[PDB]
Amino acid sequence: KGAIIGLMVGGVVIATVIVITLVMLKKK
Amino acid sequence: KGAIIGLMVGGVVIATVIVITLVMLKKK
Questions:
Q1: Domain range for residue B12?
Q2: How close does chain B come to A25, measured CA to CA in Å?
Q3: At A27, is the secondary structure helix, strand, or coil?
Q4: Structurally, how many domains does chain B consist of?
Q5: Nearest-CB residue to B8 (from A7, A19, A26)
Q6: Residue in B9, B11, B19 closest to A9 by CB
Q7: What are phi and psi of B5, to 5 degrees?
Q8: Which of A6, A26, B8, B21 is deepest in the core (most CB within 10 A)?
Q9: Residue/partner pairs of B5-10 with CB below 8 Å, 24 or more apart
């Protein structure tokens, strides 16, 4: 039951990724 | 079944939010 949810908070990790690439475009 | 998953892609929306506030700090 809890294992299924672990997928929800999992995708939220995509946020930091989106920002990480952006941090590269900020200085270029 | 599909309704439960709709929660997964749901949180992913938190990404745009995080970026939105950042876009404000970029020019200030």
A1: 1-28
A2: 11
A3: coil
A4: 1
A5: A7
A6: B11
A7: -65, -40
A8: B8
A9: B7/A8, B8/A7, B8/A8, B8/A10, B8/A11, B9/A11, B10/A8
